[PDB]
Amino acid sequence: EKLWVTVYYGVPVWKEATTTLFCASDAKAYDTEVHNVWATHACVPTDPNPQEVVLENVTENFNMWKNNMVEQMHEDIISLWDESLKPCVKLTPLCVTLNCTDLRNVTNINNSSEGMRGEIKNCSFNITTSIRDKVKKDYALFYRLDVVPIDNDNTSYRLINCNTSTITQACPKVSFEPIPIHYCTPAGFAILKCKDKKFNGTGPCKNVSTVQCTHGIRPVVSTQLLLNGSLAEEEVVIRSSNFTDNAKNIIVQLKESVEINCTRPNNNTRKSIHIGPGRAFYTTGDIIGDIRQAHCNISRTKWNNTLNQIATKLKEQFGNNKTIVFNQSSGGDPEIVMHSFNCGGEFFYCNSTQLFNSTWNFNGTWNLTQSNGTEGNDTITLPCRIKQIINMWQEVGKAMYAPPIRGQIRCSSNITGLILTRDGGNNHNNDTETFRPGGGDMRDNWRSELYKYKVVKIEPLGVAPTKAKRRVVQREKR
Amino acid sequence: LGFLGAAGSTMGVASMTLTVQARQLLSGIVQQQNNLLRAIEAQQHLLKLTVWGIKQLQARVLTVERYLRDQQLLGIWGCSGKLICTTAVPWNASWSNKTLDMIWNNMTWMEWEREIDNYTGLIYTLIEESQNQQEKNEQELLELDKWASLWNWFDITNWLWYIKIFIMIV
Amino acid sequence: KLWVTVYYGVPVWKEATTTLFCASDAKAYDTEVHNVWATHACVPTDPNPQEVVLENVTENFNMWKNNMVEQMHEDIISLWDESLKPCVKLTPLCVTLNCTDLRNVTNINNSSEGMRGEIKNCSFNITTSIRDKVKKDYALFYRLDVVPIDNDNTSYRLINCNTSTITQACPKVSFEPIPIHYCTPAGFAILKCKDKKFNGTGPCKNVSTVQCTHGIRPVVSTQLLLNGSLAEEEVVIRSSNFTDNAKNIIVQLKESVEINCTRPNNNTRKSIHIGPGRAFYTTGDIIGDIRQAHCNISRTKWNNTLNQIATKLKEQFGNNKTIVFNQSSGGDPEIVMHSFNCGGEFFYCNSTQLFNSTWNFNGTWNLTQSNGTEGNDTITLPCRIKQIINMWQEVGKAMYAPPIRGQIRCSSNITGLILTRDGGNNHNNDTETFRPGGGDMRDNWRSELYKYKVVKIEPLGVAPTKAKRRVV
Amino acid sequence: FLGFLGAAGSTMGVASMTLTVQARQLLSGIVQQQNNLLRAIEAQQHLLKLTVWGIKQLQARVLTVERYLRDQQLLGIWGCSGKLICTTAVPWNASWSNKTLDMIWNNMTWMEWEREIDNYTGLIYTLIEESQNQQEKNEQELLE
Amino acid sequence: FLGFLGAAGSTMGVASMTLTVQARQLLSGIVQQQNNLLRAIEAQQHLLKLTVWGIKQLQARVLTVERYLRDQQLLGIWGCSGKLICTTAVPWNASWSNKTLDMIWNNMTWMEWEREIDNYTGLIYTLIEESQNQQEKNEQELLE
Amino acid sequence: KLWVTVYYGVPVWKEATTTLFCASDAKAYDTEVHNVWATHACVPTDPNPQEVVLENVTENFNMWKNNMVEQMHEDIISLWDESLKPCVKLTPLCVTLNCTDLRNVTNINNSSEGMRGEIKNCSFNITTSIRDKVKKDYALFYRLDVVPIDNDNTSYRLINCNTSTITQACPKVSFEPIPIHYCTPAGFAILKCKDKKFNGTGPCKNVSTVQCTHGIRPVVSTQLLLNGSLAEEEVVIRSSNFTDNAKNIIVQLKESVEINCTRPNNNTRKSIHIGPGRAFYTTGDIIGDIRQAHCNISRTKWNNTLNQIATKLKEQFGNNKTIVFNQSSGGDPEIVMHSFNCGGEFFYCNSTQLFNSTWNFNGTWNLTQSNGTEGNDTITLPCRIKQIINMWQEVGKAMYAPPIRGQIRCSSNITGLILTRDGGNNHNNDTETFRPGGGDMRDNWRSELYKYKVVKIEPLGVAPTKAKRRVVQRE
Ligand SMILES: *[C@@H]1O[C@H](CO)[C@@H](O[C@@H]2O[C@H](CO)[C@@H](O[C@@H]3O[C@H](CO[C@H]4O[C@H](CO)[C@@H](O)[C@H](O)[C@@H]4O)[C@@H](O)[C@H](O[C@H]4O[C@H](CO)[C@@H](O)[C@H](O)[C@@H]4O)[C@@H]3O)[C@H](O)[C@H]2NC(C)=O)[C@H](O)[C@H]1NC(C)=O
Ligand SMILES: *[C@@H]1O[C@H](CO)[C@@H](O[C@@H]2O[C@H](CO)[C@@H](O)[C@H](O)[C@H]2NC(C)=O)[C@H](O)[C@H]1NC(C)=O
Ligand SMILES: *[C@@H]1O[C@H](CO)[C@@H](O[C@@H]2O[C@H](CO)[C@@H](O)[C@H](O)[C@H]2NC(C)=O)[C@H](O)[C@H]1NC(C)=O
Ligand SMILES: *[C@@H]1O[C@H](CO)[C@@H](O)[C@H](O)[C@H]1NC(C)=O
Ligand SMILES: *[C@@H]1O[C@H](CO)[C@@H](O)[C@H](O)[C@H]1NC(C)=O
Ligand SMILES: *[C@@H]1O[C@H](CO)[C@@H](O)[C@H](O)[C@H]1NC(C)=O
């Protein structure tokens, strides 16, 4: 009946801790030696076979809002972007009055100036390059949004954020293509994966596994609709900090991939004007062919069902006997008001009014509408304005100019999630709930993937009472 | 696999008795990973302190500290030899008032430590380390025995082969 | 017969020089504010420091050759350098500065009472982020920040302009000094003298060790040590060579003297844009009468304080001695006039009413007591503001401080004095003189680090014993 | 009982029983024991992008890691890697301070005894290195 | 490192003479020695600060330490963390080599020896630690 | 029975790539004021280095496939990046320069010297820190660093000003090369091929090993190799593919040739303050007249050394082929003119005289005799001076050398050549046309890291034995 401490190295005991994660991406990118991605350049290779064990009989508590991974991932992507644009030309010298004459395409009225009118502004200006004593008059086919009327004059515009921020042009060579990034924990640490088929933002996650490396979390930054992300399993899942609270954002994860065909159907000849010693400012030379409106194609039926599905879950989350309004964003940052995301290296400010507009009766028919022909289903095209000057999402002092991508641009992203925002607005006799689209927080975008991951440390050493005792005998012979 | 698992299995379960194996595997996985990492750093050689570079560097240091600290304790406790090591320190009812069957067959390792954490320090950081210090002293204090050394020398004088000759006669 | 016995963990330490790290209090974290000294970067301070005492020990100390002083000298200046590194450079700001006597054209507020000239309302045509736009803008520069130019009664310019850059201090960063705990890496330790009186260099009977220094506020002050540590029931005087004059004389006080300092000016902030995403902050309008900055000091307290110091100095330079407290002869305003930072605002005070004392050796030394507060006018120190500040060891690299919106209130604790013995021929009359000193971040560091020294711990040890390695 | 360096003034004998106290804090350090911090910085976050202090803390860490390792490596060369108090077969030398064990362990403190042996130390270390060579050689003959 | 491998790799036998028992401890000894010399240097200058060379030395220090650990970790996996030359219970799968033990030790150099085994060398290591477990499981039955 | 036994420290290495740390005596750290290629960082070299000779060891060394050359190149470039990072930039100085008054006295001064206005009393309406006030100043700029504009016989600018940023190097920083010992970390080793002459790639008979490389000077030169190493008993020609014409021909000499070089002028070092805390450095008149920089080569020694190289070239392409040392083909001046740095000052020396010799195997030559020891033994190299150095790899990132005060004198040790074989139509004529080359600093490092090869150290080793783990078997 005598127990003595017996130290065991390798006991299966762990503790919720935080550690410096390291990136691990496929080596193929290193072999291609493109090294144009704003990350992955020095990112180590990934274990060909992911190593995961089943934590059976285990019940770990998981909290998305308290997942330090999201905070770290946020800092990582923020720095990676800064790192990439750190050594690239700035548009600080380009800060002059811009004589923005409308594109000669206005002379070609055709049909409402072809696709769009005033979207592109052939602006001219006086610049001082490496030669300071000598000034130079140059023209740049800038788009709208990037220009702001200044003197209230007809052809008097200026680069947006000329004084509010320092416009830095991202090096044209660099490529803004998110490639599967796998965050990995160092030895003595382990990412816990909420394996539960369905899991609310916070709470004990039953079905649970673990990984030493996150799945390929593409650092895709997109507003409202989450493109190219992790699809929900079987059931669309809505996650909020405080659903009843309005300020809080609402993370809706779609179970099915709504493929979106976005393209920039304009053949573009890119130009470059030298501004500063060994510094060249890239702009657009000419829009060869009729100027057409950039647009994205999405099956109404698919989206109609997707809005039907989410609506049901929103009803389950709140009052199943309440009305539900998908009103469009109530103003705010252009990114928040209109779906935005990167495609081919150009950010597409695309309208999403058509997407978020339909409403639903608590007792309305809940059937999945089928297609009624190519013309019947058609596609939800979106008026898109390309804003090259892109400001930081959480800082005003920093803004980045975007090099024009020469030639036709086209992408095929999968819609995998949607950020919404509940607004009670004193619903008359309640029985109503508005869910305008949300976005603008990169963290929110990262949570959509780390929703299951949870970093924990490991403690192999362990002591326990055992009838056995250390034998005081020391002499080998006696 | 890099993972011990078997956390849910309560202490004493065949898995908890076969932990040694999974631990030998893990200790090995550490090299399988370290060697892999080293091989790459030899090829890519992008150890440049980049955004990921610094991360990799911090990560490398953390792993070393983890391995070193756990081994240091083992060494001071006189347990550097193998994972499992019985010690001479008896358990106090204050540390726990449960039968071995309870503390084991009934408690999982995670659950167990949780209760002992309140005493974990006094158990090993103090008494256990002291035990070894006293043992070490007694060792050399017993190595000054003159007759023992002379008899021990006699053993090396024949290198304990005389007994083998007896076996040869047998 | 004996055999070497390897003893691991022997309690033996040796003087060493190593890098140290700061461990700021976790309360600073909670505040969630950007400190210039990166108090947030500093690791959390261990709740209770371990001050294990080394009994039966007599460790010698050398405060004048301590590495930590030099190491921190660099650490504090680097912290400032990296803090103001990414801030507006105020480079284009310098141009032609046409100025007026006061922001008030006449006695609009208090021209008569207001120190005429202290405003020097200078106007200038600066270029905004738009390269093709020039704008006339006005600003207020205390005489200490404007130099007459072209000998034009109204033409002036920034003081350290032409010579070096004057980057404005990033406005978000706070300059509130937070206690800092320099901690030794594992395998290293800091030894602390507990002796109630310590010369600074020599043996120590009460010696303790700490893995972490006590909290030290990195305050930079001249002719004075503010918010510093206190001696023990005795003012202590330390100098590498007391019989030498140049060697600045460090004094640690046993009693703290309160110093209330404030800016009685309600000021506003004007963000003149100078460059894309670069906003220069200046004072827009002062709301009300203009009152010069000052500091309140007790007569008796300061009197009693000097008395004790004077005695210590006679005990240092022969009993029979007359300690004459003179002021600084001349040199950089930094070391001529007592200067200190207050709520993100530099203050140059004329401590003439703190360093004016002859005191005959044969005089009443009875501790002066307060009889009537009305009669005991709290010494008021004439204080001004030098917004542009300059590095102490470097001619170039000057820095600007953005104005703070509103009146500022400070109340630090006098805790030390820096002095410079001058061997005037009058010494033949035993009239010892100790002019105020300063001008060296190191002198301030030596005052707070005298009791600490860092030693590497060597756990490896050998010893002879009758025990022998047995093969069997 | 005694603190980290509590046996500093204690005789070599008394201090010999407290060796573990120091050995326990050779690698154990506040920065290393931080693990997860109650601060936005997580495991030194990212060295705060190599801050003035981030470097210091990083550097200070490597010195604790290399130093402890160096000390172990030594004991490892001397064979008694895991052991704390070892027993060498190196015969003692009279020149190394002709003193009786009573004075050494009941009077001289480790700090004092070291200062004396400092003059002749590295030599002893080499004598152990070659003694293990002889030991390994002898053991090899037995293995054969 | 002064006498770093003072004697070059001869026939594994001639190399496995006193040379191995000595050079090994001398090599590891001088390795620590030169590492200790670096400690005095960085203590004397303290100029190593994220410089082209400062980053080089910092990464080099980390490399050496982690490469030392991997070697020692491996010794630990097959309970050989004590003696530099530890025997195992694993027999030699003739597939690894048919070479006469004499030749292996009389007409073969370590440099050549490892290559023909570079394929199995890793396979062997796994058997070495797997057996260590078999032996421990047996020790776990010897109840000692 | 055979039981595998683990052996620690088995003498086995493997070609590896490892980060190398510079090790210099740092004897210049005491002179903290003086900084050179980060001398302070370089940890002091071991006072007693020992080369362990690898007896009965043969190894292959690929002087070209040598990672060290690559690392040195990256470290050398990064060193310059760090040195120029905090230094000033001539961005605002790229103004229209009214370059006139080539020289004060176009009569007695330049007179016969081929000066023809090398320096120019160039004046320019540039601003200063005052910003508001704009002042015109005059500074002598070398015709080499200046480029004419509008051909108005007046408007001029800096050769790279419009297309490249010029960063003024900090004057306090010296550019004297110091011995840098590239030391490998523990667990790694640098093999040393000790054959008398090494083809550059192949099995090496004599092989040794070093913990650190021998002192290697960071010398950057073109068409020549200065303060370098010497060959063994014989000039050695080294190339990746000699029979290929493009591959640069690396030659290493067995003996050294003194190259007395000096700028024989007393120069006043005028400095111009432009921009807050920014000061440009230039020349304030030349004290006295202008003497053209020149280099002294032993006429006979050179004749002999060239003959030695020629004989080896015969041994490389058949004696039948005549060795024709032609002058540089053409291209950037850096390569066209043997250009090096003297005492922190960059030279540009015409090398036509040193490369104008046809060594026809069919012509008899009994070496050369310096009977006229006094005179007629100094091939005076017409040396020009340049201050604006362009990055050897990129178009941008140029650097200005602040003028040095007084006469700049030096004496290096020619220790080899960098040559270029030409695909001429005279291949049938058998006339190996070899012309001097340069512009690739990697070659400079190869010429010194040729005898080194970094390899990993794997101490752990396995070996079958007749012994078994019986000791631990019983527990
Ligand atoms: C570096 O050193 C070399 C060697 O000294 C100098 O060049 C050689 O100089 C010698 C004279 O000292 C030259 O000799 C002359 O060559 C003529 C050409 O024929 C050559 O080839 C035939 C092949 O059958 C040989 O038989 C013959 O000997 C030569 O090698 C000969 O026609 C000359 O013959 C005689 O007549 C002349 C006068 O016409 C006399 O001066 C001679 O003494 C002799 O009686 C003679 O042999 C030799 O050709 C040179 N070689 C080259 C490569 O040009 C370099 O000039 C020197 N460089 C410098 C810069 O100093
Ligand atoms: C065992 O060793 C013997 C000796 O090396 C091997 O026999 C040799 O086989 C090779 C290759 O075909 C021949 O070139 C030799 O002539 C053989 N020598 C002798 C002495 O017979 C044999 O193959 C080995 N067996 C295995 C399977 O390892
Ligand atoms: C230098 O020595 C190498 C050998 O180390 C010679 O290279 C071999 O030459 C033969 C015949 O010329 C070839 O078939 C081989 O392929 C070559 N390489 C090897 C590795 O054997 C070489 O000819 C010598 N000379 C030069 C200029 O390289
Ligand atoms: C102080 O000195 C004065 C003058 O001698 C004397 O009258 C008085 O009693 C003394 N005591 C006090 C008030 O300290
Ligand atoms: C530059 O321009 C100013 C203003 O016209 C003039 O005074 C000055 O002489 C000019 N300098 C040169 C070099 O022409
Ligand atoms: C070169 O060509 C000549 C022709 O005269 C021939 O005699 C000689 O052998 C060839 N090769 C050598 C070794 O020079």
XYZ file of N, CA and C in Angstrom, chain F residues 418-470:
159
model
N 42.247 37.471 -66.007
C 40.885 36.987 -66.377
C 40.859 37.192 -67.896
N 40.804 36.124 -68.703
C 40.972 36.293 -70.173
C 39.718 35.855 -70.930
N 39.626 36.189 -72.221
C 38.485 35.784 -73.083
C 39.013 35.276 -74.429
N 38.774 34.000 -74.744
C 39.180 33.452 -76.065
C 38.138 33.903 -77.093
N 38.545 34.132 -78.345
C 37.591 34.686 -79.344
C 37.326 33.673 -80.462
N 36.058 33.494 -80.849
C 35.727 32.612 -81.987
C 36.094 33.292 -83.293
N 37.390 33.496 -83.537
C 37.858 34.222 -84.733
C 37.833 33.378 -85.995
N 37.956 34.010 -87.164
C 38.027 33.243 -88.437
C 39.476 32.797 -88.653
N 40.338 33.010 -87.654
C 41.774 32.640 -87.774
C 42.030 31.342 -87.003
N 40.964 30.632 -86.627
C 41.134 29.326 -85.933
C 42.055 28.447 -86.783
N 41.829 28.435 -88.100
C 42.688 27.641 -89.017
C 44.124 28.166 -88.928
N 44.289 29.486 -88.813
C 45.645 30.097 -88.760
C 46.352 29.663 -87.474
N 45.605 29.104 -86.514
C 46.190 28.661 -85.219
C 46.760 29.878 -84.486
N 45.895 30.827 -84.116
C 46.344 32.042 -83.388
C 45.405 32.303 -82.206
N 45.532 31.520 -81.130
C 44.699 31.743 -79.919
C 44.683 33.241 -79.603
N 43.590 33.939 -79.925
C 43.485 35.381 -79.575
C 42.868 35.522 -78.178
N 43.687 35.861 -77.178
C 43.186 36.006 -75.786
C 43.136 37.489 -75.405
N 41.966 37.965 -74.979
C 41.818 39.396 -74.602
C 41.414 39.481 -73.127
N 41.886 40.494 -72.368
C 41.562 40.615 -70.945
C 40.052 40.790 -70.722
N 39.547 40.337 -69.571
C 38.105 40.439 -69.277
C 37.838 40.709 -67.807
N 36.573 40.946 -67.445
C 36.205 41.216 -66.042
C 34.724 41.529 -65.921
N 34.318 42.205 -64.842
C 32.907 42.609 -64.681
C 32.084 41.555 -63.961
N 32.696 40.416 -63.624
C 31.996 39.387 -62.806
C 32.794 39.183 -61.515
N 32.337 39.767 -60.404
C 33.101 39.685 -59.129
C 33.236 38.222 -58.688
N 32.261 37.380 -59.037
C 32.341 35.938 -58.682
C 33.732 35.409 -59.051
N 34.230 35.772 -60.236
C 35.581 35.331 -60.672
C 36.609 35.719 -59.606
N 36.507 36.937 -59.068
C 37.495 37.418 -58.066
C 37.490 36.475 -56.860
N 36.303 36.038 -56.430
C 36.200 35.149 -55.244
C 36.695 33.750 -55.615
N 36.273 33.240 -56.774
C 36.742 31.908 -57.240
C 38.268 31.864 -57.156
N 38.937 32.925 -57.607
C 40.423 32.943 -57.641
C 40.994 32.712 -56.238
N 40.156 32.800 -55.199
C 40.658 32.661 -53.804
C 39.995 31.463 -53.112
N 38.745 31.155 -53.465
C 38.017 30.015 -52.846
C 38.226 28.762 -53.701
N 39.143 28.830 -54.667
C 39.404 27.686 -55.581
C 39.901 26.482 -54.793
N 40.629 26.719 -53.701
C 41.248 25.600 -52.945
C 40.351 25.169 -51.782
N 39.062 25.521 -51.803
C 38.200 25.213 -50.629
C 36.924 24.487 -51.054
N 36.367 23.675 -50.148
C 35.106 22.937 -50.428
C 34.407 22.629 -49.103
N 33.288 23.302 -48.827
C 32.592 23.102 -47.521
C 31.814 21.784 -47.561
N 31.939 20.965 -46.514
C 31.214 19.663 -46.438
C 30.634 19.496 -45.030
N 29.534 18.750 -44.901
C 28.887 18.530 -43.580
C 29.715 17.548 -42.752
N 29.473 17.479 -41.443
C 30.155 16.452 -40.601
C 29.058 15.592 -39.969
N 28.950 14.333 -40.403
C 27.975 13.394 -39.791
C 28.741 12.431 -38.879
N 28.855 12.705 -37.561
C 29.640 11.857 -36.657
C 29.003 10.474 -36.453
N 27.676 10.420 -36.326
C 26.979 9.130 -36.081
C 27.306 8.157 -37.218
N 27.654 6.910 -36.882
C 27.951 5.892 -37.910
C 27.534 4.502 -37.464
N 27.118 3.653 -38.408
C 26.684 2.265 -38.069
C 27.738 1.276 -38.575
N 27.874 0.133 -37.900
C 28.879 -0.885 -38.288
C 28.552 -2.230 -37.632
N 28.485 -3.343 -38.394
C 28.239 -4.662 -37.810
C 29.449 -5.132 -36.990
N 29.199 -5.711 -35.811
C 30.298 -6.217 -34.946
C 29.889 -7.563 -34.343
N 30.835 -8.263 -33.711
C 30.533 -9.577 -33.083
C 30.092 -9.363 -31.631
N 30.029 -8.106 -31.181
C 29.559 -7.805 -29.808
C 28.049 -7.542 -29.832
N 27.371 -7.742 -28.697
C 25.899 -7.533 -28.630
C 25.555 -6.717 -27.379
N 24.397 -6.047 -27.376
C 23.981 -5.216 -26.212
C 23.519 -6.138 -25.079
N 24.385 -7.057 -24.648
C 24.050 -7.979 -23.530
C 23.969 -7.190 -22.220
